[PDB]
């Protein structure tokens, strides 16, 4: 379902344009946060050790 | 002043005389009669307006041809002399 949408409206987007749009939407921040949370999980285990 | 001073501004007819019924019901801008429905082919009549149907039905006029049909039937549509 997501793929259909990307093809329909965002097909003509240069990577630079896409990055700007993603930052404005705030999608990028969420991806970063999810990754950060994953890093945090590994760190906790190490601290216990 | 929606009453007496406003009634003084009334001098432009919305309706004029109609060709089929002569009623002064022919709307000037709509180009339609509000009583008989001219220029539609059918004549305006409604079953809720039964008294209006009684006002404009057959027999309220001259019946210039239909007066003689029963008499010609009774004689059997004969020809000659």
């Amino acid at each position: 379902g997501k793929l259909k949408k990307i093809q329909k409206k965002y097909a003509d987007q240069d990577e630079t344009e896409r990055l700007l749009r993603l930052e404005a939407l705030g999608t990028l921040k969420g991806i970063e946060k999810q990754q950060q949370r994953k890093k945090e999980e590994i760190m906790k285990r190490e601290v216990r050790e | 002043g929606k009453g007496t001073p406003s009634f003084g501004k009334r001098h432009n007819k919305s309706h004029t005389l109609c060709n089929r019924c002569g009623r002064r019901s022919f709307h000037v801008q709509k180009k339609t009669c509000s009583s008989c429905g001219y220029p539609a082919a059918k004549t305006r009549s409604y079953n809720w307006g039964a008294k209006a149907k009684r006002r404009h039905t057959t027999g309220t006029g001259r019946m210039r041809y239909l007066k003689h049909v029963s008499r010609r039937f009774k004689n059997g549509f004969q020809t000659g002399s």
Binding site: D12, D14, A24 | -
Partner: protein, 246 residues
């Protein structure tokens, strides 16, 4: 509740555009044979003011190649076009302001205006005063050109679409303050009946979603879903964000 004002606008009773004093649809010359195999030369007879439009128009006269007569087209005047100028329209036309070259035959960084979306609709893009389209790149195989629009968007259209070289005349208009409700009145008097605008929060609740209350306030959030229905879409429709960014 009643039917609201923007809901009533689509019937087109009193909301049609006032088109009495307009001089014709400002379209490009049709793409027959000369414009796609060579060029053709016309003449600017007069530059005139169009009612309800911020830009001036140009009356360009060509000769009909198939019949002994004259054709008169209405172009949107580019800034720098003068009366008596020869205008060249076609594939082989030289790159000067006012010429009607197709977009496949202009280099990088060219500024054009009155650009066709598809080849043949006689002008769709960058037609208001001061607006222009920049050619961002070409693509010969699968023959397309990328263009930058006045909104900042980047479109990829056909390389056979045409455009008038230069910028639309009459730019810098909206920098002058109107200063007066009379000036706004005379501005919209020749466009359409969309002025003055009563705020919906100042109405009664029968007349608008924002109406009612013992204080003038909206009530719920003013950002409206795209899936909302007619009579509900009053406010900021499908807003990704709100507020003044710094």
């Amino acid at each position: 509740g009643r039917v609201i004002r923007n809901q009533r606008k689509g019937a087109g009773s009193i909301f049609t555009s006032h088109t009495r004093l307009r001089q014709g649809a400002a379209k490009l010359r049709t793409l027959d044979y000369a414009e796609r195999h060579g060029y053709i030369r016309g003449i600017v007879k007069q530059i005139v003011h169009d009612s309800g439009r911020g830009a001036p128009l140009a009356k360009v006269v060509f000769r009909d190649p198939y019949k002994y007569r004259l054709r008169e087209e209405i172009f949107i005047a580019n800034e720098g076009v003068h009366t008596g100028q020869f205008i060249y329209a076609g594939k082989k036309a030289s790159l000067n302001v006012g010429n009607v070259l197709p977009l496949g035959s202009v280099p990088e960084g060219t500024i054009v205006s009155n650009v066709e979306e598809k080849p043949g609709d006689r002008g769709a893009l960058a037609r208001a005063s001061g607006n222009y389209v920049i050619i961002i790149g070409h693509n010969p195989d699968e023959n397309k050109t990328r263009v930058r629009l006045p909104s900042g968007a980047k479109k990829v259209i056909s390389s056979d679409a045409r455009g008038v070289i230069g910028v639309i005349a009459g730019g810098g208009r909206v920098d002058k303050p109107l200063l007066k409700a009379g000036r706004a009145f005379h501005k919209y008097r020749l466009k359409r009946n969309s002025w003055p605008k009563t705020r919906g929060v100042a109405m009664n609740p029968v007349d608008h979603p924002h109406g009612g209350g013992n204080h003038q306030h909206i009530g719920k959030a003013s950002t409206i879903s795209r899936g909302a229905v007619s009579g509900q879409k009053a406010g900021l429709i499908a807003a990704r964000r709100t507020g003044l960014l710094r």
